[PDB]
């Protein structure tokens, strides 16, 4: 709350997690194994990145768990789509795992990434959105009041960025809306993802890690 818009930006960028590799063997369920394995490993980084998000530390452990339980797949997906820019028609799950077109989910990811491309989405904008998803995904499901102020503060940041970008006010308003509207679709993709991830368990063909199952059981289905 004390941070300047630029401080928040810089703070989020230095908190950015690394891009992990898959175990994809460009030789030889398969891919799905790659996805869940990769996700599980990214989670550990997401946790320590989440604690480096301003305001997240101020929350009780209990609230922080719920927020990560709610947002993890939304976070992974926006990360993916960010990477998958400048990769028209392909999803970059990893530097060693670039794919072309559950295919519906894939197509929605494709569409989403395409939007950020045409919008010319910027890295500073990206880290704000991601910080939003974390704080907003499960805020509805004096500690929330505290989340809104942070959410308001992250909104002041986005605007600040757009103002610096030379966009007229009407433009900042419109661009701000487009981005937030896109988070709604990222919510939808997540919900669908959780469903397929649920089938895979009952399928017991896919290999879910103990942490991935605990996440899935929080979401119920």
């Amino acid at each position: 709350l004390s941070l300047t818009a630029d401080q928040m930006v810089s703070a989020l960028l230095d908190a950015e997690p690394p891009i992990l590799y898959s175990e994809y063997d460009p030789t030889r369920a398969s891919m799905m194994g790659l996805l869940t394995n990769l996700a599980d490993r990214e989670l550990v980084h997401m946790i320590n990145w989440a604690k480096r998000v301003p305001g997240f530390v101020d929350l009780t452990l209990h609230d922080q768990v719920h927020l990560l339980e709610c947002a993890w797949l939304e976070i992974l997906m926006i990360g993916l789509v960010w990477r998958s820019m400048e990769h028209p028609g392909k999803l970059l799950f990893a530097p060693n795992l670039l794919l072309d077109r559950m295919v519906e989910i894939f197509d929605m990811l494709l569409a989403t990434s395409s939007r950020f491309r045409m919008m010319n989405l910027q890295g500073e904008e990206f880290v704000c959105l991601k910080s939003i998803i974390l704080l907003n995904s499960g805020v509805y499901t004096e500690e929330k009041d505290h989340i809104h102020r942070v959410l308001d503060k992250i909104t002041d940041t986005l605007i600040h960025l757009m103002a610096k970008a030379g966009l007229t006010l009407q433009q900042q308003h419109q661009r701000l809306a487009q981005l937030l509207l896109i988070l709604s679709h990222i919510r939808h993709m997540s919900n669908k993802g959780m469903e397929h991830l649920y089938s895979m368990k009952c399928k017991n063909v896919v290999p879910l890690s103990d942490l991935l199952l605990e996440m899935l059981d929080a979401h119920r289905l």
Partner: peptide, 9 residues
Amino acid sequence: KILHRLLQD
């Protein structure tokens, strides 16, 4: 609770 622990760390 895995997610709780790793956050504690």
